[PDB]
Design a protein around this ligand. Structure first.
Ligand SMILES: O=c1[nH]ncc(N2CCOCC2)c1Cl
Lengths: 237, 300
């Protein structure tokens, strides 16, 4: 069934699983027309498919050409996500295919179940966690490859950089979700925290800065303060 | 007009014949049921006074043989039986009727209700859903499960309804996943109508039979089958016009006949709201929507 705080450690066991997030698949800017009506212009999107144990991210870039001439785009986007996840699973060797796929939004359950009918043994699950994966486009290098794409494209990342050399996948996921929650609540503050010190750089083959263990403790503390703050600024507390 | 006599009535029982019913007391001198209209299937059904649990009964067609009910004190139920011999069947009935302790099937001449509920129901198809080939009549009761229910445990006592499952490879063409799930016309017209049922009359017959088993026996898997067959039509964008017209008539008489007090368990809110207000056919069931709204507006 559903994934929640009670079965949280299942994410880091040795059964291959993938989180799928569709928030950023169908992305638009809203604008006025010359006649003063409103219109949308789509921009490139992405499916966020992540193995929480390994950090492997399968970033499927959704080019705006896939919406041309289509109707009911918000509904299509869910089926397009399910099509691409299904195509990803089929592309993986049997021993790499997931045993579970956890969707971050319940509206993905039926589209993905129908597309995975050929895989009756892969469990499709919702979650009660409020995960901050929509903030993936706040990661500069991920945003950059999405916006630059001129055609459909799959790009592979490790969202944990080299963290697993020093920490467990539970701790790596906790760090990731804290960073993303901060980036979602106040992108600018979050990004200032991460880059304020120009002596700490992002390796060409990484997404986040090369912090020592001690600097990550400081950074992690600053992100919590930010999240608590914004929670005050928002609610006045 | 045909007759289903009774050897005796040894236990207190409410007896149903089609949509009619009457109470018989323990060892009352009850002889059976006469004047049963020929040309329709019928169902004779039973609820014991001492155990309202297990409604049970028999689907039959008097053109297919001579039938009578007698109580079995070992199995503790009223059993339907056949007399292959005719003269002796008429002979046994002959003494019993001058002494007229036999209820008359009480049909009003204006009344097409039973016909409207059984228009497409055939005994030959009933006997394929209820498998017991040594008898010409079919036993059903409250607790029998369907083939599909057993997939999710005795197969000889199952209701072999046609399996409908909207999230199945049968229902969904590879490459038309979104199209076929949101518009089931492929599944209805090609898979089920052309493929399995062959024509809409057979489809409607199973639908009507599932409803009647839900209503008369409170058979839950039958209710699931009735709603599934309605939803597959309502969720198809492309349905022959004659099937929609006839569906509206079928459902109207089903809703009309349903006991007012059983609506809470026999009607699925989701399906009916979807079918009448969201589905492709939301505007095609005028009679059914009108009676539903005037009789069960709470459900909606
Ligand atoms: O055909 C029959 N054969 N055998 C007994 C029978 N009975 C027993 C007396 O009551 C009526 C039913 C009938 Cl009708």
């Amino acid at each position: 069934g559903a994934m929640n705080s009670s079965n949280y450690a299942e994410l880091f066991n040795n059964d291959i699983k993938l989180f799928v997030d569709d928030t950023n698949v169908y992305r638009v800017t809203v604008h006025k027309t010359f006649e003063g009506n409103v219109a949308t212009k789509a921009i490139n999107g992405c499916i966020f498919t992540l193995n929480p144990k390994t950090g492997h991210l399968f970033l499927k870039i959704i080019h705006t050409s896939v919406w041309a001439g289509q109707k009911r785009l918000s509904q299509l986007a869910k089926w397009k996500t399910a099509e691409e996840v299904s195509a990803l699973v089929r592309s993986l060797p049997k021993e790499e295919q997931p045993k579970q796929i956890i969707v971050t939004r319940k509206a993905m359950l039926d589209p993905l179940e129908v597309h995975m009918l050929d895989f009756p043994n892969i469990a499709i699950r919702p979650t009660e966690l409020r995960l901050p994966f929509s903030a993936a486009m706040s990661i500069d290098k991920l945003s950059d490859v999405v916006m630059k794409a001129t055609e459909p494209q799959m790009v592979l990342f490790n969202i944990y950089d080299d963290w697993l050399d020093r920490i467990s996948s539970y701790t790596a996921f906790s760090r990731l979700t804290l960073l993303l929650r901060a980036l979602k609540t106040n992108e600018e503050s979050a990004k200032m925290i991460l880059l304020s010190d120009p002596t700490i750089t992002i390796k060409s083959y990484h997404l986040w800065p090369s912090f020592t263990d001690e600097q990550w403790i400081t950074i992690e503390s600053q992100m919590r303060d930010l999240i608590l703050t914004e929670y005050g600024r928002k609610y006045n507390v | 007009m045909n007759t289903v006599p009774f050897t005796s009535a040894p236990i207190e029982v409410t007896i149903g014949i089609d949509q009619y019913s009457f109470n018989v007391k323990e060892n009352q001198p009850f002889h059976g049921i006469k004047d049963i209209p020929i040309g329709h299937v019928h169902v004779i059904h039973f609820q014991h006074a001492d155990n309202s649990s297990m409604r049970y009964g028999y689907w039959f067609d008097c053109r297919m043989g001579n039938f009578y009910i007698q109580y079995d004190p070992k199995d503790g139920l009223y059993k339907m039986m056949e007399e292959r011999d005719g003269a002796k069947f008429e002979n046994i009935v002959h003494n019993f009727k001058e002494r007229q302790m036999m209820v008359s099937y009480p049909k009003i001449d204006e009344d097409d209700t039973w016909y409207n509920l059984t228009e497409f129901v055939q005994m030959d198809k009933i006997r394929k859903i209820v498998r017991k080939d040594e008898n010409q009549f079919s036993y059903v009761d409250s607790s029998m499960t369907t083939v599909q229910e057993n997939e999710l445990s005795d197969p000889a006592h199952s209701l072999n309804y046609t399996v409908i499952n909207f999230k199945s490879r049968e229902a969904i063409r590879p490459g038309h996943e979104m199209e076929d799930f949101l518009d089931k016309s492929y599944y209805l017209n090609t898979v089920m109508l052309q493929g399995i049922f062959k024509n809409s009359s057979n489809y409607f017959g199973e639908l009507q039979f599932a409803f009647l088993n839900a209503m008369f026996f409170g058979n839950y898997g039958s209710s699931l089958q009735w709603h599934a067959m309605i939803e597959l039509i309502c969720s198809s964008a492309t349905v022959p016009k004659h099937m929609l017209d006839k569906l509206d008539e079928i459902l109207y008489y089903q809703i009309k006949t349903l006991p007012e007090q059983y609506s809470d368990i026999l009607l699925n809110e989701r399906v009916w709201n979807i079918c009448l207000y969201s589905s492709f056919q939301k505007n095609s069931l005028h009679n059914t929507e009108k009676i539903m709204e005037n009789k069960y507006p709470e459900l909606l």
